[PDB]
């Protein structure tokens, strides 16, 4: 148990403190980053978690709690929260205020693809449609881990399946509220981004390392979940 018997300890035995990691979109847009801080009492309602901030130079950017769900790598009562960047008005990189004001029942099953690479070499490991056996499932345990972690957290994920291109996969979100579909993707794009970090594997959400619409009824710019859903919710009723 070299650095493995730890990282997993009971919570309520000693203290009542619960961590709550703060997550936000950074960099060019594909880099989703986070850092940790505790709390006092376990509450899942987003209107009680205190605000916070960080320094953007490393530019004082404020963060507000929006999504409070559970945690893959810590269990019990530990919590992940999804927060957006506000410039010292929202920051232009946020790209969420417009979506919030537009969406303020458009269920969206956004479809996303991800490819696995061997991080020591940055290449994929090693009839291919959902193949099994040798030279087919390059880290199918990683996929099991991500699927079950997403079920545990609170992400509404709705299936996963491989294709012909080696290593790569894709998973489905299905029945998620429009604005929620801008959260439940990004967090689910985050959890996976950590899981392969355990191994010598990296997920690259890129083409070369679909948007469902089921409204309750009617009653009325590259790779951004929020931008795509906002654009396609424009024109169409809601």
């Amino acid at each position: 148990s070299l650095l493995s018997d730890l990282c997993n300890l009971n919570l309520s035995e000693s203290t009542e403190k619960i961590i709550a990691e703060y997550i936000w979109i950074g960099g060019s847009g594909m880099d989703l980053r986070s850092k940790a801080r505790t709390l006092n009492a376990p509450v899942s309602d987003p209107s009680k978690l205190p605000q916070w901030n960080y320094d953007g130079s490393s530019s004082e950017v404020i963060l507000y709690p929006q999504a409070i769900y559970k945690d893959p790598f810590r269990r019990g009562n530990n919590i992940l929260v999804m927060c957006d960047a506000y410039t010292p008005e929202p920051i232009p990189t946020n790209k969420r205020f417009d979506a919030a004001k537009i969406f303020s029942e458009p269920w969206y099953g956004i479809e996303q693809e991800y490819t696995l690479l061997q991080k020591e070499v940055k290449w994929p490991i090693g009839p291919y449609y959902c193949g099994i056996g040798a030279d087919k499932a390059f880290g199918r345990d990683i996929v099991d881990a991500h699927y079950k972690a997403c079920l545990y957290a609170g992400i509404n994920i709705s299936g996963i399946n491989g294709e012909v291109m080696p290593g790569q996969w894709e998973f489905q979100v299905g029945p998620s509220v429009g604005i929620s579909s801008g959260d439940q993707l990004w967090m689910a794009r985050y959890i996976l981004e950590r899981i392969t970090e355990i191994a010598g594997v990296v997920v690259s959400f890129d083409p070369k390392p679909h948007t469902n619409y089921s409204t309750k009824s009617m009653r009325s710019s590259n790779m951004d979940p929020y931008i795509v859903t906002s654009m396609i919710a424009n024109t169409t009723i809601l």
Copy 2:
């Protein structure tokens, strides 16, 4: 424990989702393929799962649920589902519609070999009938795993044998009622396909990498099984 901490979480606490993988026969060979997707509530009756499909060009091929049995590698309430390839007329590769219409009380204890060798070298890992000790059993952990997973799932499996020539094995399929011996010899043939894949072991069903009949009206080989189980039933129908 790299990546193995996950894959073995629980679902009775967080979300009542029960992943139900969908399985269908592949192309020319006996490559039983499958892909994963979810469900909502725990039900074992195959008359309630909705009819789903896939793309065959990677064309549209629809699948229906008929075999609903528990999971070796996921446990809990997760389920494997056996499905056959229909076209919205059964595909010739199906070879199950004729057997179903013929059988709708014969019991088939068909015998099958599952010669298994090493992955990288395609060679065995290491008076030989059911040998024990050095240079006798080139991996019995996977074999015990397959046996117990088969009993756990719901397969009515009965026996297992060793072999003299290094490598070959065999398991009995048990008292399977007619068309049921088209499920309990494929999905119980599917389970092994993952277990060897867990290790550096490849199972080579081919002869060069028996037919039973126990009816109640008192009247009386892997690869291709549907044809076999059905032709010898026609000869002695009910």
Copy 3:
């Protein structure tokens, strides 16, 4: 983690089926073989099990349930059975019919010795009389495993000790009733090989790689657990 998370699943959770490992003696008398096959209800009475058989060419040879004890490598309700070989009259290699007819309450104890050697060079791994410390005891974990497995199964083993010969040990089968005594020894020998099979070690019982008598009063030449006891009983207790 890999390949070992299986092999340890539970029985009574899914199905109340039981398994059984049918064990017979090899041609030369030093090899002990077995093959596995299931059963419906768990019963420990040797009379209730049904009579089974095998092929002697690998020539039909029948086997009857003689000794029913529990299983260390599968735990739960899994059961080992010691059975003798019958020609379709006892088979000459059986050597048990004479002992059974002779013994049909002598308490007997027989001593066993065995040498452990490396798999591919045939030398022991790594004052020696019950020695401890550097260059004294090698593979004492195997010894602990065998001792505790033998207590668990039903073998009434009594003690083990190490001697001067490198990689040499000796265990005592303890007081036990009549022919069952000899029978018990066989399972003990059996168990050892499987445990040694885990470690990649070769066990040699041959001399170049004591018999205890105690009764009430009167019943109311190559390492043979049956010939030796029959000869030493013929003269005094039959």
Copy 4:
């Protein structure tokens, strides 16, 4: 396995002998040292633990119980104790008597940074600001372990984050009352080294391999939690 089966035994059944490790500050640098000592009755009141001592030549140096917290690597009822060094008057290296006499309710939060390097080459293992995935976070397992151990012990650590230069972090000691605040820093720092000792990594706190103040009126070159805190409270809490 290799010693890991031990180190984790329970004590509430065999012997209720609470251990206690006596922690004292080292010599020139920041080398917080200790040794173990058993006790009879488990009590957390620092006014009942017996005084102890040691030899300073490796000179008698008495030690008195000040801080009683729980234990990362022993758990159960095992307790760590933080004690200051007294000459047979305070020792000059103690630096705590001045702080105690000054403080005899200013809340303090101090900032700590530490750089991780390889054991035998001194380079660190393996947009960086709180980065995720590969090439951003190296050995976050150590960091998660230290964070959760610090919550478990009794340290009221409050937050943690990464930085831009490769291979360092920063954790927030949290708001606490009086001199205990400074004490807690030392204690928490202690835990880190033990955890790093598991991984074969060297922790360097040196700059080249801030303080928060709030009162009861408000709310909640040496790297000395004592000198800096006392100097800040000299000018305000007096």
Copy 5:
């Protein structure tokens, strides 16, 4: 999980038999040998256990159950026994008869030192006074294991500490009564070797690879836990 899944099985679920490790002192006085035996019912009274013996040629030498403690390497109801060598008159190497007749309430505390070295090269593995982290403490896992095992067994050990010379330590047993005091030391010594057996390390107690006295009335040349205590009791109490 090879070879280690066993060795930790349960006792009371299958059989109520217990084990017992009979331990005697080697000829040279520095080696402490033992061998295993079985018992029917678990009893901790040294009077009820049966006398046993061995062969001194590897010359019969009788042994009696003197000290009964629990077992760290088996848990459950398994028991270790410390026994002395009696020739059917005590053997001169015993050295315990004189101490027993001298002592037949002086509390004694003895100090022990040991050095850890590599199995092959004989050099130690890997300011040192009670050092922490890298370059100070090597193999503290062995030390924590021995401390906790000694608490578990019944040895009322007091404390342990590091020292200056690389790779050597010292533990202390002080709350001991009568001749059992010396006895306890011996048993504690024994445990250490078995633990080091797991790690592939060599323990040397030799100087070149303290006695505490307190009575019920208080204050009103080899390393032999018996010779030293008998000599220092002669001048005071007995």
